[model samples]
Target: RAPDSVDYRKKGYVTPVKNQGQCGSCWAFSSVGALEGQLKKKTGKLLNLSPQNLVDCVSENDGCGGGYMTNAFQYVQKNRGIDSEDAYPYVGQEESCMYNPTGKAAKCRGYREIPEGNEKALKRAVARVGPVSVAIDASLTSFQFYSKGVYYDESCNSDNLNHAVLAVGYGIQKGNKHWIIKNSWGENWGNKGYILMARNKNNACGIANLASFPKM
Candidate 1:
């Protein structure tokens, strides 16, 4: 069940990012996703942004292979800086070494963690900061969905692997309490490219988010 207070479409909030097809560039996507939120906050321009820049220009890690959200943040810390959507456009997932139009890469050394039980981090990141990067359990059925609903499942942490995503916001939706999660599965995937996780459904996957410092 989704609450009726959160709607990005109605709010005219959209990121200028393209689709990350079959490339294992989740780290890049997550990085760009957060940057897209940051850019929106800094410039008041909701650009879809570009993950290709992170894929092609962001060095120090194995591009298109796999990486960590922390590593991606570091990549942003060291790489000059991220660009606007109009600056560097996203092509696709093909593994190219070309730093397209806007070749300026932002350098992100690292990020801090959210405080314990301070659930306002997601809201801050969305309303004040930018989109936040988070590692989640991709094994949840609701996570693998394409509609908005309260994803309640105890199997979100079976094999328990680190999967990356963008924390766009958090709040009750359509009379439901949940976390608004944005994925790289494209707009046609889950709920216009997002999934809602019940705030009380803290399974193994949710427990994995108890790091000393999260995307606060």
Candidate 2:
């Protein structure tokens, strides 16, 4: 588990990203993500580690093929945790013959599920904890970003955001008092990968929620 029983930690959710075309290892990425949160709960470290090793190993799963966060959690719970990507190294972003991993890759027992389009539960899950994982429509995501001048109007399409990222924490903006959020889109996306979504916009991907594992 997590440290000192923080409410956000308990109710926080995460997204299982498949690393997409740039990388052919969603299993490794998602597994590391869930573990990153769990480890944050345990060690309080929020370092974005590697998932290349998971790309190399992890049987019964397809590389870059879609999978759920629950299965990824199970993979971690059973193996301990995946090794840092640099140690194992990424194999040139292509599906290759499977290799038996020598290191531990933590295996999980169970996970909480967040069905598609259920935005209410997603908010409750976030209001209850730290960063939660969510998949944006990604239809709007581009290279431009601003720290505070963001505005979300009805005309602004919500379909553009389509990527999974971790929700580190939430709070009111100092001046504008808007609900500020943190994201993992390389700090170059929305507000440094941390966009300010409307408190009511929980209608869109708002707080898509997450499912974690039982501690070992």
Candidate 3:
């Protein structure tokens, strides 16, 4: 079982909010956020690693078109490292890989995946391993325009995992359990670029179907 509560933001590990614009590059952003969290936990320094670098360089993904968080991690491990947002900014469009090792800000030794369909394991991973990169069914109308309040869509399908996000923490409020996740839709989206998703509900919205994180 996981702890009664945990919050990475309370520990000052969460980086500033970011926006992926209209691009379907949530995988890139989520992977980058996971890496940033791991780096901070391992070294006590949070670096704004480049999601643009992943979007452009990771051959496994279709850039702005689509991608997976696990593939992004594979790219980072193979490429040795990636640049920061300052060195390689987000363009929100598909582009040729322009990776330059000289500008690398962080590197991943490898990655670990939470067993499929295991919310409890996923929660333990988050508390012990840092923020996790996860895929979800973000096509629902409620998610597209989400502004506040804990999101618990019973209609969301776990088999249709589409959008990627970063799960930073888990906790209970008013006897309701939820996962605190960071989004790439900007601060104006949900709780200032964050969202409280229903947790311990049998992997609601496919949050635990595809969960993983980079190892520094």
Candidate 4:
């Protein structure tokens, strides 16, 4: 059953924080984060999937230029799955496709996107589906320098989304409701590559705009 609050870290499904470096591949990282979550929940085994696999192999995507989770999800399903990070480690940028399906780590049957702008649907998805891949406008300096706290920016336009993150879970702290978001800018960014974003605050930063999760 879905709960009021959930954190995949407690279930050992959360992966280590990663960095996109000079690449605009947050979409890939976010996709793999959500995929890994579902992969673990279904098989009881955790494996690090490769973001580089998408950047290089998913021709529908723009590699380091930019991409979307929808195309990323499609690539995994049609490719018969994806490779492990160990086999196709991230290089921060796209490379000539060297896909080897024999090294497949996880296979996605399909994916589901929560209705756009539905924060309640996001909460329920995270509560039941483990981590979810979501988009938000992190264009404000407040988010770039956000260290620790319930992050919010009134001007964070919901439709101006330029970043994607893994919505792992949510919780309340000191009377403040917040969502536990995982970033891909490495452990040094935000609070160890994580942030407590304002929750129930009318979808601050568009956290619910593009929420989705893979079906393993």
Candidate 5:
């Protein structure tokens, strides 16, 4: 059985919280964060991979307008790899594709997706591997102003996922289970840029609907 609790942040696998600004590039950030954790777990090296590389260069996903993590992984695999944030910082807006394939920071051989609507599989994936990228319905006002406490909004639609985030860990609180999610809205938005999303509730908010991670 998996551990009762795990936190990738406490284990030094997760990177610092990032800001996606007004751009709809949460998918890119989530993909990069998961890969960062995977690299950290494998090589003890944490890299802030370039989401702007995806924003600019990836054609399968509409740049800043919106996209999906699975497509991001495919782009990385097809292109061999991506650069670091320092090499290609985020512009928060759609810009011309300027990525140079020669100086990539890391490469993804492939990715794996958790079974849709399967929270148990997701927990196992997180406990055994590393952080995973997950898309959720962040349309609720409470999620927008989320500060502390485990979030459990009945209004969150699992079938209408609109935003993506990284599931870094899991734990139980007040007799309730939750997934510790790292958001891209900056540190001021939630619990140090994280959220304890309600877990084991039939895959609430579609947390497990599109769960996936990179293979480094």
Candidate 6:
């Protein structure tokens, strides 16, 4: 069973928040976040896994355009591993791949996905694991401008998943359940690079859809 509340940020499993900017590289950030958490859980040191490596190196995914988290994990599993942010810093845009095997700072055995549309399973994973990579329907203007409060948009659809983020933790606040979601939009946005999204709203914004965690 999971705890009542869990925060990888409190345990030093979370890396610094990043910005995807104009690039549609949410998948890259989400993938890196997952592996970074696993890296910390195993080694007790949180290394910033290079999202740019996934952005430019992973052939299956369209660089700076779009991608799938499952394919990114497989690339890291088969490849030498993921590079560190120190070696392959993010540029927020696609560029030629310049991956160095020696630069690999984190590697994963594989990944596991929660049952589609299972919020309880996701919270269990978040409390058990460090952080989880997840997708959500972040199409509404309210989500884009979300500053504070437990975010829940009736317009946000479950099956209409689009953006990807890291589910770091969950807890009850303001008489409402919420998931601590780390965004790639930088620290200037929502709760210091994070958002407390509505949890008990029957999988708000498809938080449980396309959810997975890295195997360390």
What overall lDDT goes with each candidate model? 0.58, 0.46, 0.88, 0.91, 0.91, 0.90
Q: Kindly give the stretch of ten consecutive residues in candidate 2 with the minimal lDDT sum.
A: 1-10
Tens-digit lDDT track for model 3 on 54-153? Answer: 9888887898898988898888899988898888888889888888888888889888999999988988999898789999988899987787777888
lDDT of 1: 0.58
**Cα lDDT of model 1 by residue, 88-175, tens digit:** 6666554665554354433343576555334444444344444566666786565675475766676677346567776655677567
Question: Alpha-carbon error at 96 in model 2, in Å?
Answer: 4.2
RMSD of 2: 6.0
Error of 3 at 139 (Å): 1.6
After TM-score superposition, the amount by which residue 152's alpha carbon in candidate 4 deviates from its true location, in angstroms, is: 0.8
Query: Which parts of model 4 are misplaced by more than 4 Å?
Result: none
Candidate 6 has an lDDT of 0.90
Model 6 per-residue lDDT tens digits across residues 1-216? 789888889999898899889899999999999998899889888778898999998999998889988889989998959899999998888899898998889888988999999999998888888899999998899998999999998888889888999999999888999999999999998889999999979888989989998797
C-alpha TM-scores of all predictions: 0.74, 0.61, 0.96, 0.98, 0.97, 0.97
* Per-residue error (Å), model 5, residue 89: 0.8
Cα TM-score of candidate 3: 0.96
Off by over 4 Å in 1: 1-13, 83-96, 100-110, 115-128, 140-142, 173-175, 207-216
Query: Which wins on TM-score, candidate 1 or candidate 4?
Result: 4
Better of 1 and 3 by TM-score: 3
> Which is the better candidate, 1 or 2, if ranked by lDDT?
1
Top lDDT model: 5
TM-score of 5: 0.97
Model 5 clash pairs are: none
Off by over 4 Å in 5: none
Order of all candidates by lDDT, from best down to worst?
Answer: 5, 4, 6, 3, 1, 2
Between candidates 2 and 3, name the one with more favorable lDDT: 3
